[PDB]
């Protein structure tokens, strides 16, 4: 029952890694221990310079072979125990007990909380790469759970850990369970408890603030690298890691009306959909304030009728307007002369049948406004047409978080523009 | 089929990779081709959907195994030919011709220029990790080279390429030869030319500007990641990638009188030495203009007498001054009352601890020159906080080159240094010892 | 499931196939843990792959290394370890796994697979007797279950078992390992699995093999001497000696307190010392008989003869009584009164300094000796003028020498007093024949 | 409970006072832990008290013992160990307790108390240089704080410190312990405490001392060779050598791949090898000057002369250039063209296998060598028709004196230039000592 202790989560400026290692060596002087780091930690860890204690540096180096940064190269045992900074080994044979529980149980990961101020708690975790979203909540089948929040020693087989794509990506507490829950693996939170370091790290408030700031930065870089734009929680809390008003939109310029995310087998990033909803809400409010007649058109109306929201793989919003009302709103009249950035940061342009309103100068998620005019009972443009009675009157229809205006009998409207059964038969990307 | 074509250097928004792949498949439909990218290139490359053509996405992903991001997974031949975008296979049998050249010669790499506007040139290259420097120059033994500049097809054994730490780090033209030259590997530039693409990529000024801005940023991030702080060409045209007046110094706060770079088995970063030289030159200029008697002290005098410069693993500069001259310098007068940032950004501070003066390069970069005031008492210069020495060593002072300018030293500075440090200290440098530092701490 | 560390100990720095050995295992598993152990840093350089799963363990002391750096167990983190000799290669995949599976399913603590060299391993029996400084090898009665192996094999066992041995990696391992495992009652199961030989084997020339076998023979002799194995025997009767001879010093040096140093080490007289004592006793008896000197077995030599016709197994000399008036009959004896004498066969004869007796040493360098004690009859009682402070040195009736009787001793027939049971009990006490004890029980019994 | 274990390692089996030593400590505290350590069972018997707190530790492999039995840590259950030499005696009670209090309150990893023998312990300075294979001793400038002790002392330190060393009990302990502790930067504090001498001291006769010193000198010589200490010096002088010489082979033997064995050991050239190189260079230069052969420092020899007036400390040979027209002046050189020549002082002169140069070896057995490279002017440029880059002739018109290896040698004029033509700009100012990590990557 040989188990390698692997230490990955610690701060170079303030840690208790020397105590952690010394505590395990007191139980077994030949205990295999691997401390992993991206760069050489300074101030020096001053680990014992003995063969069974090794420092694994995970970044590329001009003077090292490929194997030097591959962590499975440092681990020869069957099992590996991820130990966070702040833990120490007090009683003996706790790793042995964790191995017995693993072999006895049915979960590929077992875990023992560390008696810190934040001991690990069970969590449910639901990962959707298609929607760039990870959803956390309370674990129904605790102590069997999908993920952990807080400090714990996690033990699993080395073949399972090191076949993951990013086994030691920081923060491990986020990166590991995103990967294991995606594979359908479970973590069993055992009744065992590891003691806290007798001289804990981050004792001052300034040190904790510094470490929390670095940790938030690593977590944001981790999720952006792995394609999680949104972390949502049971209870409603949202964590965003995508585009915003001051950034580019996530996918950039589209070619052949097929954005980049479709080729990646994903749908629209949720940050982009959120920006489209807020631009739709804003533009609708401006048009209504100015007394401009608008209705939902195209895929926006289709999504409204289907689920009251933007079709989750679409990337813009379409609205029809009465051409004779264009002069009622200041932004459209200005858009005739040139680009208009109003006081809320939205960009109105004509560019030349329709109008386009972009979320901001940097974020080019947009709503298109298509003017129509009644020639003799039929609404028509100049660069397909439909009868005007579909607009007399307009009906309230929920869309993107607010009540929009839609053509009356819009299911019939949508089936003239798209064909029979379009609401019930979404054209899923493949 | 013994060679796998590997394409790493291209841009997603403007490339000729489809023509490249097609040109090799026209010569052999079974030719193994691998296009490597960090993320899925957009717009779609639309490569042929055949077994011998594979798109390798090297970034880790939540739904992929570890092997998916390791490039050797995608190659099953003995050799790899790194082909840059803009090349095209025209004459058949060029890859087999490069293989026979490789086996018959003594170079680990062989290369063939691509007939673009920037065809590959033979270069010399020495990599010094201790000095954080990559020194380029004209190749003395061309067409045997240490590195190439320009477009070339580079062929080498897959075993050699994928044994490197960063085999496909971008730009390849930079990272590959930094790694192979450090290992003492040569590349032989053959008398073989690959044709250019018939529709070349980046054919407009705007497209090239986008590509060069992105390639410049990738090169800067690569050299910082790999610890190359200075790149030179024939000892000149310096390119810096380290600290400066507006940043922190490279190694930050020193613990246990041992800076971080010693634990990394290197010497002082050259950007840090450059800033130390500039600060010593500036402080000396100020002290001389104000009429302050100074002399090189400690390891600065030792370095000056040894080779006329800072000891390349030291991280500060020491000067002795006459205490009765302190009042002549505005900055030193101001330093007694508090921290002073002078008109050129240097920070002058009075050490309340050891009673010396410290001049820092800038408010953010704490590379410093220390000033040690001495006063005579019965012919011996002495201090009040802590070795004292006879004053006759200062009567008179002598000129001594140091750090690119002529500094002042005690007369008989060899005897002076020997009394301070011991006999033979000038001829026996205390070279850094990683093995010993690993044992002592 | 099973993690196994390959450990390489048996190779020569001047000529080896260790690079091919390690690379062959790395081709089956790139992360395969491999430990090469050496006493000093091999030059020319081994040039192993400088990857973290391949490590070199130097078993020398060094001023800049902790104690753990030379203890090989700190390099092995796996449950199992496989000793692999130079000249072997990993060809078939998963052989270490099959060896682990056979270990767990069997009852032996060691399992082994031969290597397809010109000398593949063979099953051997072995009992070790430290007290008699002897290791006895024979044919395996219950093959494929053995006490030892002869030849090249991969040997797999638990790290906890290997590194709790006193000298796990002492060279040659093929000798050292099984001396330690057989003494502990452990068995090695010889499996029907075969490792391939290296494609470019080491020691390809006759001259390279010649300097390798001489270096190995030097290491084996040093090993057995360090571990106290004086004699190795094989079925068929072949003997290898590693102790005394005519041309060296005796094994144990000067004796204080009647108790030689090996008895405190809980061992008996080394078998080489006993052999020399028998040869010297046989020779001296022939000289005295040819010279017409009446002699009889005395002291511990007579007691050992009466018990089992041989030297007492912990005794260290041989004692004979002779008639004083016969001394002039022997040329060596007459010369000994004038000084030290080295005779026709290299034996050294001297008149001692202590107490009026003669001593015959095996050689000038080897001081195993026969002591000749001259007696003369006063009036029916044998006596002498100077006495040693032993309870065994007394007068005795001359009728015990009239006549002398034959008695086997040390491989030949010797002359003994008649009624030697009563003779021995008079000088040693009742029941001495039936109650063996060490020379002086007050210090060691 | 006791906190110190007395450990005895330095004694002779044939003549010791270890029984008196043990008894004296047991008289102060009958439970006092005592360990006597030895490579083999001491004979004659020590006859130590048969009590659980007195144990004989045998540091030898044995067929019938576990690995723990030969590890001294196994025998010590206390925090501290007191290494006590033979000839010491415990009289004043509680001396071990004072040493513990002294160690805890001070800043030295070791503390020590002299034994009142004829050779009390003295405070010494000690610099250990593994790269130079040298142990340099001297007077201790900051006594009572020392790097090493010479003489008899009880030395106390933590068990975990002592047994963490590679060779904690290697003999002589007086040498091996401080070589290990001084290299680590540990200090020993010589306390103002004195242990008494044994009432019946060991080795009381001149003959017994002579045998003990002979065995101890043999142990020291084997210890220093095993640990890679080739040179011991006192105050820079009184040299004591433990390496190669005129009668032996050179330390590193045959060089493969132009990378001598000491580089892989992460050390520089052994000082015995450097000493023989300086002697051979001085001899050869003396021969060539007396015979009228014009020579000059070449290659790395000239570089070492210009940098610090000596051989570069990681080089292993010496290179000189000569005028080919002058080779007939020297008898040794003229005989070297016919074959190998062993001159009157044991030096071996040979003409190169291939390469057309001369080689002078220190002796028939020691192959440390000086190479002579003959050039000849071809219209103002020096050239050898065999290939040492060709250079113009005016650098030898004239030659200049340059200190090298303890004597004055000839160098090309403007040798700073000369070196930069052959090695590159700034070569004198930029020495790069061996990089073992780069060697581990390069091969
Ligand atoms: C080769 C040899 O000597 N083997 C012996 C065997 O003869 C004997 O039966 C057994 C038990 O005494 O001990 C062993
Ligand atoms: C043992 O010595 C090594 C130095 O070689 C050091 O790293 C380690 O911490 C030491 N251990 C103890 C317990 O002193
Ligand atoms: C994950 O999916 C299940 C259905 O498979 C759903 O019931 C559950 O609520 C999801 N988890 C979270 C945290 O939303
Ligand atoms: C992945 O799993 C396989 C099978 O369990 C194993 O052979 C391989 O070593 C693993 N990869 C690692 C540990 O990197
Ligand atoms: C990879 O490079 C290392 C040098 O760090 C070398 O030791 C090793 O042999 C190389 N492996 C291969 C397969 O070339
Ligand atoms: C000796 O065996 C024990 C178990 O019996 C084990 O815990 C220990 O690690 C072993 N020692 C060595 C040096 O392998
Ligand atoms: C030891 O080294 C120091 C500093 O290098 C030096 O001052 C001292 O003289 C040296 N002592 C000896 C005995 O060599
Ligand atoms: Mg702390
Ligand atoms: Mg659109
Ligand atoms: Mg300083
Ligand atoms: Mg007898
Ligand atoms: Mg006797
Ligand atoms: Mg040479
Ligand atoms: Zn977005
Ligand atoms: Zn810098
Ligand atoms: Zn013997
Ligand atoms: Zn030498």
UniProtKB/Swiss-Prot annotation, chain D:
GO terms under biological process: adult walking behavior; basement membrane organization; bone mineralization; brain development; camera-type eye development; connective tissue development; connective tissue replacement; creatine metabolic process
The name this protein goes by in its record: Ribitol 5-phosphate transferase FKRP
Residues in the Lumenal compartment per record: 1-443
UniProt keyword terms in alphabetical order: Cardiomyopathy, Cell membrane, Congenital muscular dystrophy, Cytoplasm, Disease variant, Disulfide bond, Dystroglycanopathy, Endoplasmic reticulum, Glycoprotein, Golgi apparatus, Limb-girdle muscular dystrophy, Lissencephaly, Magnesium, Membrane, Metal-binding, Secreted, Signal-anchor, Transferase, Transmembrane, Transmembrane helix, Zinc
Pathway: Protein modification; protein glycosylation
Cofactor(s) recorded in Swiss-Prot or TrEMBL: Mg(2+)
Cysteines engaged in disulfide bonds, as pairs: 123-146
EC number annotated for this UniProt entry: 2.7.8.-
Consequence of substituting residue 371 to A: Does not affect protein expression. Loss of ribitol-5-phosphate transferase activity
Top-level taxon in the UniProt lineage: Eukaryota
Family statement drawn from the similarity comment of this UniProt entry: Belongs to the LicD transferase family.
GO cellular component terms given for this protein: cytosol; extracellular space; Golgi apparatus; Golgi membrane; nucleoplasm; rough endoplasmic reticulum; sarcolemma; skeletal muscle myofibril
Organism: Homo sapiens (Human)
Binding site for Mg(2+): 315, 317, 319
Tissue: Expressed in the retina (at protein level). Expressed predominantly in skeletal muscle, placenta, and heart and relatively weakly in brain, lung, liver, kidney, and pancreas.
Main subcellular location of this protein, as a coarse class: Golgi
InterPro entries (UniProt xref): FKRP_N, LicD/FKTN/FKRP_NTP_transf, LicD_transferase
Entry PTM: N-glycosylated.
Disease cited in the entry: Muscular dystrophy-dystroglycanopathy congenital with brain and eye anomalies A5: An autosomal recessive disorder characterized by congenital muscular dystrophy associated with cobblestone lissencephaly and other brain anomalies, eye malformations, profound intellectual disability, and death usually in the first years of life. Included diseases are the more severe Walker-Warburg syndrome and the slightly less severe muscle-eye-brain disease. Muscular dystrophy-dystroglycanopathy congenital with or without impaired intellectual development B5: A congenital muscular dystrophy characterized by a severe phenotype with inability to walk, muscle hypertrophy, marked elevation of serum creatine kinase, secondary deficiency of laminin alpha2, and a marked reduction in alpha-dystroglycan expression. Only a subset of affected individuals have brain involvements.
Catalytic activity field: 3-O-[Rib-ol-P-3-beta-D-GalNAc-(1->3)-beta-D-GlcNAc-(1->4)-(O-6-P-alpha-D-Man)]-Thr-[protein] + CDP-L-ribitol = 3-O-[Rib-ol-P-Rib-ol-P-3-beta-D-GalNAc-(1->3)-beta-D-GlcNAc-(1->4)-(O-6-P-alpha-D-Man)]-Thr-[protein] + CMP + H(+)
Function according to Swiss-Prot or TrEMBL: Catalyzes the transfer of a ribitol 5-phosphate from CDP-L-ribitol to the ribitol 5-phosphate previously attached by FKTN/fukutin to the phosphorylated O-mannosyl trisaccharide (N-acetylgalactosamine-beta-3-N-acetylglucosamine-beta-4-(phosphate-6-)mannose), a carbohydrate structure present in alpha-dystroglycan (DAG1). This constitutes the second step in the formation of the ribose 5-phosphate tandem repeat which links the phosphorylated O-mannosyl trisaccharide to the ligand binding moiety composed of repeats of 3-xylosyl-alpha-1,3-glucuronic acid-beta-1.
Membrane topology: Single-pass type II membrane protein
Alphabetized PANTHER family for the sequence: FUKUTIN RELATED PROTEIN (PTHR13627), RIBITOL 5-PHOSPHATE TRANSFERASE FKRP (PTHR13627:SF31)
Consequence of substituting residue 270 to T: In MDDGB5; severe form; brain involvement; intellectual disability and cerebellar cysts on cranial MRI
Annotated glycosylation sites: 127, 164
